[PDB]
Design an enzyme around this catalytic site. Structure first.
Site, PDB file in Angstrom:
ATOM      1  N   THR A   1       0.792  -1.150   0.082  1.00  0.00           N
ATOM      2  CA  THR A   1      -0.109  -0.017   0.084  1.00  0.00           C
ATOM      3  C   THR A   1       1.089   1.047   0.117  1.00  0.00           C
ATOM      4  O   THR A   1       1.948   1.142   0.424  1.00  0.00           O
ATOM      5  CB  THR A   1      -1.040   0.215   1.295  1.00  0.00           C
ATOM      6  OG1 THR A   1      -1.842   1.110   1.235  1.00  0.00           O
ATOM      7  CG2 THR A   1      -0.117   0.111   2.694  1.00  0.00           C
TER       8      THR A   1
ATOM      9  N   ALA B   1      -6.015  -4.273   6.643  1.00  0.00           N
ATOM     10  CA  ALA B   1      -7.255  -3.699   5.997  1.00  0.00           C
ATOM     11  C   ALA B   1      -8.441  -3.682   6.830  1.00  0.00           C
ATOM     12  O   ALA B   1      -9.218  -2.993   7.284  1.00  0.00           O
ATOM     13  CB  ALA B   1      -7.638  -4.185   4.489  1.00  0.00           C
TER      14      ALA B   1
END
Lengths: 236, 200, 229, 251, 239, 235, 196, 204, 237
Positions: free
Chosen positions: B1, B49
């Site tokens: 990410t 997440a």
């Protein structure tokens, strides 16, 4: 644990314990709070001057936080308990939110505590009513009242305790934008308001003030004597 | 990410990629890493997440309850502290969470970076993620407080693009958000392929 | 569960009527007496039984809390027994902590704290006993009286139970500080004779003494020899 | 069961707790205790209500109760509840010393005990503590201090005050006699003896029927002392001589 | 006001709440259980309050374990609770000690559970008296009755309810020890029918159960054929 | 007297405390709510005790959520806890199921709290007495505009238009007279303020009443003083 | 590891700290402030594990300010130090130990300036000067060399600058800017950051 | 080891109607000296002194807990504690935390309140008391102190000889231990006075 | 006077007055009729409106696919008992993957209701429920009281003026057993309408019907859906 319903409804739907606690508040020493544009004032009636008391210990006007203050009528011990619980709530709120507590918030906390005691098992109502004064973040002056019932309202000016109805009528008549304009005028207004209820006058009152971005300040006895003498001048 | 956020004169920009991976396998290339916590402040995802989504949603409900009770919207600092205090309870239990809580309040534009480790810090520029190291340099070279809104959009988009180019685990599309005093706006969602066409 | 409201509360005058009634219960109990000699302290009480059928040896009013502390009562025997059990436990807790025998004053304070606890605690009546606690510590004798209220007093000599006022007057008349333990035993036995209302004998009384050796209750033969004169 | 409940906590129709008041009546009967503040020290004086001949005297005092290095307290009311409260006070002070490694403030200790005493009034369905006790201490912040508490949990700071039997007459005498800021410990002791003679039913203060204690700061350390029988007998004799000299003035 | 709690005594040393709970069971309809050589037989005069209620409603012959059965009088709610307690006791006994609980031990344990409630103010005495019956080849047939007080005794024959006394008068004249279950069921039916009052009680359904060697140590409801034969015999004998 | 416990039925089958609380709400200030296809209105009388009391602080109408608002009468301090539960419940519904919570469900949730009061054998933290308030919940859902009335007894009923408080009986008679199913939100607002003017002891002012509406399109909205003055001058 | 330094003097205590915060290889923030104002006349410098520092510091802060509110006077520096030592030691053996290294500085009207030292194990020691972090190893010897108990505050600032210059020269990590604050009888006085 | 983290040493010795307890002054972390004025000997009475060495946090914590318990004990009893009584209380305190031990090894040295009979003892981590007639030592340099005390100790030493003996012993022992030193403070307890001195030492 | 105020107190006559008062509570409620046939079980209720504007207070509730209830008395206690019942059926399906038997469910309700009647500071559940469900055995109708006793019924009614409903049902009971669903619900509607005042008549607004059957999971037919069922119902002189 002692689990019992001290407070219960009665025929005609009145909570007798709450009403009796309000009666207990009525017996207590007078207090008067007057909201002002750049000031908020609190005053309280010394029940008597023993002539041996240390003035410091018997004070009824207490700082819950730097930005907010309170005064009370009713049972002094219960007042002390709620004051400490409100102080710890102020610090915990500051810890959690990284901002000073607002007067509405601390008033709501005290009200919720009192209401819990009015409904919880095995607890009498807190036998007090409190005038909570503080300045919001904007600088807007704030004055609130709390009752043993747990209801809370904002008042431009209000009184609690003995003589509260009479002095409330007096400041209902006498409150105006002119008196609020000057800080000295606000202080003189509350001193007059108290002077009706207290027979002795002079040094039989305790008065304090808070200003925008200032801590609670308790006026000196000679200073309140100067204000009281000013009231004598105004009569003539 | 890779996620990116910075404050400039006309508010706060927030940018992020859209890639989610499990090991090498790219499970999704269209995840919306920027989380719309509420109309007035928004957060980002880095690390786990599930952890980020769950805890930021809990923050959202707490913020709404605070708004209803106090009749004023929570400050970004206060919300960051709520999140930090929430995650600190579970310290050492495997939470991996990286967040940038972005919003306005009486203070001004506010940017706070919260972490599972426990750090909460305010700064003009932050980047959290695997590609944050690559994003930081281009962002630092470009960034200035006196920056046009379009210029800041360009800086954030290209920063996320270069980070995707270098880092393996960041890719997809560059979602971009601009916080303004009224609230956040979703300014763009450019695929890194058409950005590769554009910049090169 | 159990009740959690105090059964003892202040009356309009300002008195705990349950406590004063417990004192009345104590006064109705069998006489007990204590005298503090220079070299010791004596505890004595009448052990009159309903009939010959009762085995006097079976149960003892005078009981050792520790090696060097023992106590006697006038009042309700069951309350006395739970109190002596708790007192032995308190002394042993002290010994486990500090590894010296519990002082007499401290044990009196702890049992008095227990007696106060049952005064104020929920759903319990006060204890129906007053205890006399005798001890030898630091080469000094001690005598203590603990009431149902939970208040302890230190006495050179005292009486409990029936006719305790008359007994206290008799002791005030007949007590000297320089008394040795033997003469003190004789005086206490005379006090019990004042209100025994029967033919005294080794079986129908108890005596207990504390000295440098420790607490011990006189055997039937010993109290017979003492009763001879 | 509701039927057997005494309902100690409830308010009265007039607004009074009434158990606190009934316990205050109990305290009114008890042995008199007074405290007088002075520039160099503070004193506690109290009637030894138990004065039977056979009673042994082995203690620091019957009702002087050292609580800490820097403070002590005298008691009027139910003695068992007093013992409980004094033990709680000592625990509170030593907990403060554990946390902060400094001696507890006098007012802070008084507030802690009074919070407990209030809590018994507020909830729990338990009788209030039927005790009022005088506190004396010295602290860095305020100096020599004298405090009083009540069963309600209200507390105050008094330059001089009295509790127990005829406390009203005692304070009435104290107000005229007391000189604010001009008292020394010797004059305070004399005033204590005068007030004790006035309040106590005994025509002569026997010097076995009183326990007098003083707190003073000497060489950076508080010293709490109980005046011995010879000293208090000298005080009583001096007061009687002064009363005779005033009697000479009468004629 | 000595009868408002079971933590109280009368001045003459009676706990009136328990006696009132016994009035409760005296109000309810009679149940009889008669021991015999082979086993125990239970019978209940189960009144039908309304025609609407289905057959088998308000069952008053519970099964507290495979080898033991209950018969109850008084408040059926309290009876159901006691049945749950007894079932739990038997299950716990099998779990811990590895065999079917003896009837004497089960009766003692449920009796102690009942006795626990007469002591304290917070809980009221049970409004049910009930009979336990079981059979085992090692133990033999056993019938026990437990009152609201908690007294537990063994009965060759027993009755609980309105016509306890008259039912006992009839049960005495049976020669129970020689008799077998197959005749004893007919005797149970005739006794129930004779004690039933037609005027006061509109209608009843004879509810029967037995345990014994014929069943091989199970409490079970009587087959409909045998119950019908018993009811026909009872109506014949009633005249 | 405390002769009888909180949980005791009367010989007529009514809990004494519940009956007394339903009597207690009659002491409270009047409120009116009306249901229309275009939304629902919520209106209350502030009942200002004295002039100096700042009229803003009286909040007898509150926002449970964007799509639900409610008004209350009786012991408002008791209502504070119930509205707290309503807020946390609707937000918990949003957190769990990612959707708005219908007014029936919210009223079911708050009503569940009532009648859970007990002296003992309940919990460490428990309600000693029934709540002393009646709440009118109003909101728009998938079903549409809805209004529900929750009494101290915990019974919740959908109502086209309802009045709670001291003058609820006369207000309800007037509402039965005025109301029709095709009523518009503006007409409903006007009718509600007319009935409030009838019942209120003091002459109606912008200060001494509070009104709010939630419509299908918009969130719960409290009419400001300018809006109140416009509507009242229109009246 | 972050750097904390304290130098006590006749009528003052000087405190300084690095201003960086770091994640893995990158300094996320250049103006991070590690000084906490527990009252008007005490500061608590805090370094240690992430999160534990701010959480523990804010707990001590709320408790000290609550003490001020309820009592009407402020805790002394020694009492504050013993209080935070108590709270830290209590949690050492608990499930939630705070890995936090403290340097507490204060002034008292009675007892004068005071600088206190605490380790993550919660051992408390008053010191004339003290430091925390890996940089303490480098900088303490310079303090040992040039410190005098009668050092003037300007000289103390110069000594601080010497120590930080040594950190720039030798310490591998980058600590570009340092806060400086001084506590005296007047109060906490902020000073310009020493910078390179 | 855990006890070696902060170092430190304490020694006590018994003479004729006199007691001496001494300890080093170093407070440090595993190799960094932080201060040279750590208090490892705390006055637990008019003539009763406890000396603690081990982990510094447990030293301070156990001292404070002991002062709490002892102040309560002295206020309740009305009499100063006896040394054996303090030993037993300390053993109870340590053994209460038998698991998760306090990493400190007390040494208690004092005269009896009334008899003025010298008393010295030591306790381990989990409270095995050890009363001894000549000397007791605890710390990192225990073996050095043991050998030196074994040799130099003499029965019925006067106060001056006791001071010289314990002083030489502490100096020579701590000079041969790395984590202990930086000065020594010694307290000589006599019936009529307590005298405390600081010794010249190798700062290394 | 002394005995009535508490549930624990037994009266001298062998009765607990408090449970009788709780039964009077269910008697003071809107009437309901529960009815069954060989292949179906129906519930019918007079949903009662406080005012013309008000809705009629959901009398019939869903417990599970195969069980449902009609409430009379305190609706809050009714909802509490319904939550307990729903949790028990959910736990049965979770644990054993089968519908909970209706008789077993009413047994659990009996135990839960019984526990308050025997303890201090607790009251009976002031509700009477009519429970209708389809099980492997067949259609079942059950009635529960505030007293924990429960009954198994061919048909039953509870609430205000329900004796007339029981009268009609007792008269017409034979027809109900062999019946189609429409005829059965019509019979129940007539029985329910007997309780209603002569001035009022059944309407789509004030009637709710609950039906469960072998193929029909328990379904509540509302004001719009009752119109097929009340299409007949000739007259009520």
């Amino acid at each position: 644990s002692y689990d019992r319903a001290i407070t219960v409804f009665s025929p005609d739907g009145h909570l007798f314990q709450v009403e009796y606690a309000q009666e207990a508040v009525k017996k207590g020493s007078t207090a008067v709070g007057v909201r002002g544009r750049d000031i908020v004032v609190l005053g309280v009636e010394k029940k008597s001057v023993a002539k041996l008391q240390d003035e410091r210990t018997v004070r009824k006007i207490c700082a819950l936080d730097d930005n907010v203050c309170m005064a009370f009528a009713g049972l002094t011990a219960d007042a002390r308990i709620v004051i400490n619980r409100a102080r710890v709530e102020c610090q915990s709120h500051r810890l959690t939110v990284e901002d000073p507590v607002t007067v509405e918030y601390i008033t709501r906390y005290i009200a919720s505590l009192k209401q819990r005691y009015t409904q919880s098992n095995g607890r009498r109502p807190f036998g007090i009513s409190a005038l909570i004064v503080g300045f919001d973040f904007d600088g807007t002056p704030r004055l609130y009242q709390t009752d043993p019932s747990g209801t809370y309202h904002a008042w431009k000016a209000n009184a609690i305790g003995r003589g509260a109805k009479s002095v409330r009528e007096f400041l209902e008549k006498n409150y105006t934008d002119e008196a609020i304009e000057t800080d000295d005028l606000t202080i003189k207004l509350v001193i007059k308001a108290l002077l009706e209820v207290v027979q002795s006058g002079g040094k039989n009152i305790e008065l304090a003030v808070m200003r925008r971005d200032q801590s609670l300040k308790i006026l000196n006895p000679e200073e309140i004597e100067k204000y009281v003498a000013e009231i004598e001048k105004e009569k003539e | 990410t890779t996620t990116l956020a910075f404050k400039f004169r006309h508010g706060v920009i927030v940018a992020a990629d859209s890639r989610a991976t499990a090991g090498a396998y790219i499970a999704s290339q269209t995840v919306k890493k920027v989380i719309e916590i509420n109309p007035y402040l928004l957060g980002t995802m880095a690390g786990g997440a599930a952890d980020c989504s769950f805890w930021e949603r809990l923050l959202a409900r707490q913020c709404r309850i605070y708004e209803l009770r106090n009749k004023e919207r929570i400050s970004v600092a206060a919300a960051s502290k709520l999140l930090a205090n929430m995650v600190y309870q579970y310290k050492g239990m495997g939470l991996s969470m990286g967040t940038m809580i972005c919003g306005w309040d009486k203070r001004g534009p506010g940017l706070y970076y919260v972490d599972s480790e426990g750090n909460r810090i305010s700064g003009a520029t932050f980047s959290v993620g695997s590609g944050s190291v690559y994003a930081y340099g281009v962002m630092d070279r470009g960034y200035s407080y006196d920056l046009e809104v379009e210029q800041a959009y360009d800086l954030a988009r290209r920063a996320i693009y270069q980070a995707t180019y270098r880092d393996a685990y960041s890719g997809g599309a560059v979602n971009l958000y601009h916080v303004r005093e009224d609230g956040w706006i979703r300014v763009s969602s450019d695929n890194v392929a058409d950005l590769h066409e554009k910049y090169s | 569960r159990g009740y959690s409201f105090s059964l003892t509360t202040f009356s309009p005058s300002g008195k705990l009527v349950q406590i004063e009634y417990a004192l009345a219960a104590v006064a109705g109990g069998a006489p007990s007496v204590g005298i503090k000699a220079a070299n010791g302290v004596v505890l004595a009480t009448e052990k009159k039984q309903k009939s010959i059928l009762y085995d006097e040896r079976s149960v003892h009013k005078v009981e050792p809390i520790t090696k060097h502390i023992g106590l006697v009562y006038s009042g309700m025997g069951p309350d006395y027994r739970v109190l002596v059990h708790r007192a032995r436990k308190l002394a042993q807790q002290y010994y486990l902590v500090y590894q010296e025998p519990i002082p007499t004053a401290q044990l009196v304070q702890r049992v008095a704290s227990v007696m106060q606890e049952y005064t104020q605690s929920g759903g319990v009546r006060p204890f129906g006993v007053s205890l006399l606690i005798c001890g030898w510590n630091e080469g000094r004798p001690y005598l203590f009286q603990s009431d149902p209220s939970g208040a302890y007093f230190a006495w050179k000599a005292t009486a409990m139970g029936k006719n305790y006022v008359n007994g206290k007057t008799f002791l005030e008349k007949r007590y000297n500080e320089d008394l040795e333990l033997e003469d003190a035993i004789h005086t206490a036995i005379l006090t019990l004779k004042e209100s025994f209302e029967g033919q005294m004998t080794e079986d129908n009384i108890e005596v207990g003494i504390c000295n440098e050796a420790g607490f011990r209750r006189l055997t039937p033969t010993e109290v017979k020899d003492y009763l001879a004169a | 069961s509701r039927r057997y409940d005494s309902r100690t906590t409830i308010f009265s129709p007039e607004g009074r707790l009434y158990q606190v008041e009934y316990a205050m009546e109990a305290i009114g009967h008890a042995g008199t205790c007074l405290g007088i503040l002075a520039n160099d020290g503070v004193l506690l004086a109290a009637e030894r209500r138990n004065i039977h001949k056979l009673l042994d005297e082995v203690f620091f005092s019957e009702k002087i109760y050292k609580l800490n290095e820097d403070m002590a307290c005298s008691v009027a009311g139910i003695t068992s509840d007093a013992n409980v409260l004094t033990n709680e006070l000592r625990l509170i002070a030593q907990r403060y010393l554990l946390q902060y490694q400094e001696p507890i403030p006098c007012e802070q200790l008084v507030t802690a005990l009074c919070d407990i005493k209030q809590a018994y009034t507020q909830f729990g369905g338990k009788r209030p503590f039927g005790v009022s006790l005088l506190y004396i201490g010295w602290d860095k912040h305020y100096g020599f201090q004298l405090y009083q508490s009540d069963p309600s949990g209200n507390y105050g700071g008094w330059k001089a005050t009295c509790i127990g039997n005829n406390s009203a007459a005692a304070v009435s005498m104290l107000k005229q006699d007391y000189k604010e800021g001009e008292m020394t410990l010797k004059s305070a002791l004399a005033l204590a003896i005068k007030v004790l003679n006035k309040t106590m039913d005994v025509s002569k203060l026997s010097a076995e029927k009183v326990e007098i204690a003083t707190l003073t700061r000497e060489n950076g350390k508080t010293v709490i002392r109980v005046l011995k029988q010879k000293e208090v007998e000298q005080l009583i004799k001096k007061h009687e001589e002064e009363e005779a000299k005033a009697e000479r003035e009468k004629k | 006001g000595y009868d408002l709690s079971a933590s109280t005594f009368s001045p003459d040393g009676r706990v009136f709440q328990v006696e009132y709970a016994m009035k409760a069971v005296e109000n309810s309809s009679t149940a009889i259980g008669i021991r015999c050589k082979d086993g125990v037989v239970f019978g209940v005069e189960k009144l039908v309050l309304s025609k609407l209620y289905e057959e088998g409603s308000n069952k008053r012959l519970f099964n507290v374990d495979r080898h033991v059965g209950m018969a109850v009088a008084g408040l059926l709610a309290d009876a159901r609770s006691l049945a749950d307690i007894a079932r739990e006791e038997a299950s716990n006994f099998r779990s811990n000690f590895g065999y079917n609980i003896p009837l004497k031990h089960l009766a003692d344990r449920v009796a102690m559970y009942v006795h626990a409630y007469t002591l304290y103010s917070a809980v009221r005495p049970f409004g049910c008296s009930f009979m336990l019956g079981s059979y085992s080849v090692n133990d033999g047939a056993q019938l026990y009755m437990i009152d609201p007080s908690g007294v537990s005794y063994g009965y060759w024959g027993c009755a609980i309810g309105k016509a306890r006394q008259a039912a006992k008068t009839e049960i005495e004249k049976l020669q129970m020890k020689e008799m077998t279950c197959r005749d004893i069921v007919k005797e149970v039916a005739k006794i129930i029918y004779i004690v039933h009052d037609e005027v006061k009680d509109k209608a009843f359904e004879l509810e029967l159960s037995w345990v014994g060697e014929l069943t091989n140590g199970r409490h079970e409801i009587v087959p409909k054929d045998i119950r019908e034969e018993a009811e026909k015999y009872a109506k014949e004998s009633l005249k | 007297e405390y002769d009888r416990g909180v949980n005791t039925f009367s010989p007529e089958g009514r809990l004494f405390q519940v009956e007394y609380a339903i009597e207690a709400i009659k002491l409270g200030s009047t409120a009116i709510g009306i249901q229309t296809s275009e939304g629902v209105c919520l209106a209350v009388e502030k009942r200002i005790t004295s002039p100096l009391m700042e009229p803003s602080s009286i909040e007898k109408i509150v926002e449970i959520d964007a799509h639900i608002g409610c008004a209350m009468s009786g012991l408002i301090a008791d209502a504070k806890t119930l509205i707290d539960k309503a807020r946390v419940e609707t937000q918990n519904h949003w957190f769990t199921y990612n959707e708005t919570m219908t007014v029936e469900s919210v009223t079911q949730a708050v009503s569940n709290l009532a009648l859970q009061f007990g002296e003992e054998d309940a919990d460490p933290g428990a309600m000693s007495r029934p709540f002393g308030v009646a709440l009118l919940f109003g909101g728009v859902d998938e079903k549409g505009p809805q209004l529900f009335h929750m009494d101290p007894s915990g019974t919740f009923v959908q109502c086209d238009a309802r009045a709670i408080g001291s003058a609820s009986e006369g207000a309800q008679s007037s509402l039965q007279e005025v109301y029709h199913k095709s009523m518009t939100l503006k007409e409903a607002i006007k009718s509600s303020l007319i009935i409030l003017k009838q019942v209120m002891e003091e002459k109606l002012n912008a200060t001494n009443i509070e009104l709010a509406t939630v419509q299908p399109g918009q969130n719960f909205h409290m009419f400001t003083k300018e809006e109140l003055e416009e509507v009242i001058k229109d009246i | 590891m972050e750097y904390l330094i304290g130098i006590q003097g006749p009528d003052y205590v000087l405190v300084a700290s690095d201003r960086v915060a770091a994640s893995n290889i990158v300094q996320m923030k250049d103006d991070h402030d590690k000084m906490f104002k527990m009252s008007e006349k005490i500061l608590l410098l805090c370094v240690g594990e992430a999160g534990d520092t701010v959480q523990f510091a804010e707990y001590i802060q709320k408790n000290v300010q609550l003490y001020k509110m309820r009592n009407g006077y402020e805790l002394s520096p020694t009492a504050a130090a013993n209080f935070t030592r108590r709270n830290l030691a209590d949690c050492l053996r608990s499930r939630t130990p705070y890995h936090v290294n403290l340097l507490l500085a204060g002034y008292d009207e009675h007892e004068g300036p005071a600088l206190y030292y605490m380790d993550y194990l919660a051992a408390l020691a008053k010191a004339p000067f003290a430091a925390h972090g890996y940089g303490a190893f480098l900088t303490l010897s310079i303090l040992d060399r040039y410190y005098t108990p009668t050092i003037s505050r300007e000289r103390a600032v110069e000594l601080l600058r010497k120590c930080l210059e040594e950190l720039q020269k030798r310490f591998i990590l980058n600590l570009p800017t340092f806060s400086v604050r001084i506590i005296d009888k007047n109060g906490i006085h902020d000073l310009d950051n020493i910078s390179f | 080891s855990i006890m070696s983290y902060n170092g430190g040493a304490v020694m006590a010795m018994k003479g004729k109607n006199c007691v001496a307890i001494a300890a080093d002054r170093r407070f440090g972390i595993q190799a960094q000296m932080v201060t040279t004025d750590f208090q490892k000997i705390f006055p637990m009475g008019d003539r009763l002194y406890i000396g603690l060495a081990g982990l510094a946090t447990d030293v301070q914590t156990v001292a404070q807990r002991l002062k709490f318990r002892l102040n309560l004990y002295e206020l309740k009893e009305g009499r100063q504690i006896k040394p054996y009584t303090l030993m037993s209380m300390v053993a109870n305190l340590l053994y209460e935390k038998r698991f998760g031990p306090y990493y400190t090894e007390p040494v208690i040295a004092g005269l009896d309140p009334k008899t003025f009979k010298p008393f010295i003892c030591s306790l381990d981590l989990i409270g095995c008391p050890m009363v001894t007639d000549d000397f007791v030592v605890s710390g990192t340099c225990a073996e050095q102190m043991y050998g030196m005390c074994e040799s130099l100790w003499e029965p019925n030493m006067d106060p001056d000889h006791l001071f010289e003996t314990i002083s030489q012993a502490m100096l020579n022992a701590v000079d041969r231990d790395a984590v202990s030193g930086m000065g020594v403070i010694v307290h000589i307890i006599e019936k009529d006075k307590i005298t405390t001195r600081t010794l010249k030492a190798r700062m290394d | 006077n002394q005995y009535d105020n508490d549930v624990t107190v037994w009266s001298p006559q062998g009765r607990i007055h408090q449970i009788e008062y709780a039964m009077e509570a269910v008697k003071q409620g809107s009437a309901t009729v529960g009815l069954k046939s060989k292949t179906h079980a129906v519930l019918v209720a007079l949903k009662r409106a406080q005012s013309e504007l008000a809705a009629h207070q959901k009398k019939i509730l869903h417990v599970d696919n195969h069980i449902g209830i009609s409430i009379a008395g305190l609706t809050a206690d009714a909802r509490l008992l319904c939550n307990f019942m729903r949790q028990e059926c959910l736990d049965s399906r979770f644990v054993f993957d089968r519908p909970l038997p209706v008789s077993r469910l009413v047994s659990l309700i009996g135990s839960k209701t019984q526990i308050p009647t025997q303890r201090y500071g607790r009251r009976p559940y002031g509700v009477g429920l009519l429970i209708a469900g389809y099980d492997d055995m067949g259609p079942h109708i059950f009635q529960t009281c505030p007293s924990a006793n429960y009954f198994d019924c061919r048909a039953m009614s509870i609430g205000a003026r329900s004796q007339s409903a029981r009268t009609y049902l007792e008269r017409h009971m034979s027809e109900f057993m062999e019946c189609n669903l429409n005829e059965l619900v019509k019979h129940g509607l007539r029985a329910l309408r007997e309780t209603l005042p002569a001035e009022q008549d059944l309407t789509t607004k004030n009637v709710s019907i609950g039906i469960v059957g072998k193929d029909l999971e328990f379904t509540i037919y509302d004001d719009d859906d009752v119109s097929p069922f009340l299409e007949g119902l000739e007259e009520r002189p």
